[PDB]
Amino acid sequence: AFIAAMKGKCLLEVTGVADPTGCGEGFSYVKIPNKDADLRRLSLKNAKQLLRKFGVPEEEIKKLSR
DNA sequence: AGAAGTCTGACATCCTTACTCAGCCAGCCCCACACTAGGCACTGGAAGGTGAGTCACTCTGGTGAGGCGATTGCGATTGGGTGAG
Secondary structure, X not given: OXXXXXXXXXXXXXXXXXXXXXXXXXXXXXXXXXXXXXHHOOOOHHHHHHHHHHOOOHHHHHHOOO
């Protein structure tokens, strides 16, 4: 698994059971493959006011991307 | 004492009624178009509302690719049997 990952054949799940620590420290070398109706009726403006009400940050409110 | 501006007083004409019978107009009555100006109606234009179509986004379905994974095939190793010394 590790030598195949070094050639770029495949990837390795770095968290797994092959982990020699048994905790989150250390890697595991085993192969993984490399491979609304009423919401549309919010009619942008009221959805903007709803995002203001929930506490969504002003950047997302500002974008104005319906 | 001489002129002046009225002033009662003593006449002088053409109103009346009036025929009459002329020939021609002026002044009213009773309307004829006739006519002007604006009320009513019609037409046109503008505005507003509704309906339809299009655009964008999201969801669902279909197709493709992968995917891992089992199954099959091949190769290698081990064991057993037979033959030879």
